[model samples]
Target chain A: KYFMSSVRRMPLNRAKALCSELQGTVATPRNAEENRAIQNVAKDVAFLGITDQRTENVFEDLTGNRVRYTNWNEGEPNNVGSGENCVVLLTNGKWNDVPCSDSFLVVCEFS
Target chain B: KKYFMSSVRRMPLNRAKALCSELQGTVATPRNAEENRAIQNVAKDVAFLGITDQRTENVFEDLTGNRVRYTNWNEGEPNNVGSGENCVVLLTNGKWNDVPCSDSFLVVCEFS
Candidate 1:
């Protein structure tokens, strides 16, 4: 398995497309250690595979796996302004909801 | 003079400014690559910078209304992507981007 970090910003959909083109998917950190590892390597905020766009408050990984582990910043998932449906990983190892159109770096994982 | 990155608060731009003021400092306004890198080294989140274009379009200024002299905008950034992206944020890697002033984020403070 390998994980790659993108240096440029792109919308969530574009990030997913790029990951697929690389024979992977947007990264889904399976556990705390993995999450922390990703954080350490990420130069800044990065788009992950977790999102609830189809239905609010229901996030899933690209593999259709329910998000069993999480490290959201306090008072997060507030879904501020009603359009914050996609998840981004901060360098602090916490997750935040942001607009899918708000472009950021991307992380891709290959199994 | 020194720069300190605050723990995550996830508050709006105004609140971040208020907090920095309360700390006897202003939100960080790095003037050079050295200052920018110092702030970036400690920031873990999208930290607030003391830069805004609230008064005029394309005229970004610091808290004291002094025009910013140095910048490190990410590619295609400072685009003011959505409505009212009048504030600036410094990513952990040291690049900057414009964001909505109402969007909540952590902050950094500078003190002499």
Candidate 2:
């Protein structure tokens, strides 16, 4: 069969819900290690429609703890006392604190 | 006066404490807006060395919610049930879920 793909975007909460519904079914993984593996596989396969490449890249940068860009916004990344050592993706292609409660766009892929 | 800055690296918890300590004294901004402003100012002035520039940008990108790169790991994000919405910065310069319960590296700046 020809590989098929789909794209969708919704509130972070809704997107997450979709992921759960698809989990263990169309997006199901084989095992624990496979859970993330399956999710990743689904994300790339379906092309769920992300806002941009930079956001994806930023996600990679922070999660991996690897910094690639040389240009910074003058002042940044102060891990304050509240244990606010989180990463945030701003609308201007910049990141700040990673807010746990806020909602953002999610992209998924499938075949 | 000649502007002076300092750089330090510790666990995420310690780094945050340092920021709080410096907040009111040297990094004080006088108000709420100033709190963040002060933090930013202190962060910029001190020049705390970061693991990499990409990390900083990643923080900015996610917090800012702006995508700039075109390349993505095969099989990208899949948010599952239980409101597990999060981002995880892997060691391979890749990003995944954003787990709120985890701790990572911290960068701080100061002037001397």
Candidate 3:
């Protein structure tokens, strides 16, 4: 039995980006059934003390249906030693390391 | 008696003040016509010897009207220097010695 402690909903564009980037990765679902399974797993992983780990990365398209990803711009993601990872989902459905003041879009999740 | 001179305008408050003072002076006794005639001659004198110094007479009206009376506000005016040369006109019809900044009144005239 898994519990969802947090969620970082992304926009269609950013979700799409993430989906594309992770197409063949372990993070991507192998099929529709696998996608459902992974989603259920992600929900449970939330109850497992999952915390934000990226540094200033933004999840650009977390506003609507799909997901996308974009890289953090240059000279950004200056996390300033906050020890908090800034996660971001870009237009291509990918994630990147970034600083909080970097101005990219983002959603936060917590356990 | 036939020449004219410049005029001297006086402030009412100051004229009132001068009248009170010139009440007994030789330049004060005359009535309005004499006063008016005097003003006319004084105006004509402006076309003559050209005055403006109390050095020899009571030219206080024209006092320093020309040259700058700076120092001896005390010294100089060497024409037979004496102890009683400065003409001090008291408020009459009221004319009086007033610093340009002394807050006084005056009347003026040119050849009548």
Candidate 4:
């Protein structure tokens, strides 16, 4: 139920549009296995459909569901600057927050 | 003011719940900084404090189904790392961390 969108990289908003075209939004890993699955499929620091755009610092899934699990990199999701609201899954399997405008590889999931 | 009692024996979360009920109380839960401080003060060590997310991942509640009003999750916690961490413990630093319900730990109870 997960896959890489394309060889192309794009920002969070554009990436979300692409995934939506596939009838799936960006992915939201609920546990380590799925997180790893997303990471393995992307093979890079790809986006993982969780963000705090609506309310700074509180992450929710792509569908606006409450996030039940997280694998944050140490001292990260720091929202480091003025707009690090979008989440990305690093190849190391840890997560970090970066600005939504920065483009990255796309990964998506479907039920 | 609420009163909290610490247990001498470490026990699983279920047994701790039973003991607290037997004392006409519930496992201690903090709804504010003062109560959290009180509970932490009485606990001999990291102890169970009446909150669990067993019903729904990431949605914590006490035994009576009251939503957790105040929380102090330690960094990178409630991670449920890969699931199974449904119970909560009050850390020595007065913060909260999710641990397995099966883990035996110090217990604290409170009376309204």
- Local accuracy of candidate 2 as per-residue lDDT tens digits, A24-55: 01222223443343333233322121212244
What is candidate 1's lDDT per residue for A1-111, written digit by digit as tens?
A: 445577778999988876664346888888998897778657899988899877788898876677988889888888998579899998888999999999998876655
lDDT of each: 0.80, 0.29, 0.28, 0.82
Question: Model 2 residue B76 lDDT?
Answer: 44
Give me candidate 2's TM-score against the actual structure: 0.21
Model 2, span B18-107: residue lDDT tens = 442332112111123332333344342222222211344233232224432322321544332244323332222232233222244333
Model 3 over residues A2-82: C-alpha lDDT tens digits?
111123434323423322221111132223443343344343221111113421233222232222322333543444465
DockQ for all models:
0.01, 0.01, 0.00, 0.01
Per-residue alpha-carbon lDDT of model 4 for A6-107, expressed as tens digits? 456789998887566434578888888888888877767888899999888789987788798999999988987676999988989899999999998878
I-RMSD for candidate 3: 50.7
- RMSD to native for every prediction? 15.1, 25.2, 39.3, 19.7
Over 4 Å off, model 3: A1-111, B1-33, B36-53, B56-90, B93-103
Instruction: Please write out the lDDT profile of model 4 over residues B1-112, one tens digit for every residue.
Output: 5777677778999998876664346889899999999988788689998999989888999888878878999988988865579999999999899999999998887765
**Candidate 3 docking classification:** incorrect
DockQ-derived CAPRI band for the predicted complex in model 2: incorrect
Q: What is the lDDT of residue A67 in candidate 1?
A: 90
Report fnat, model 4.
Answer: 0.00
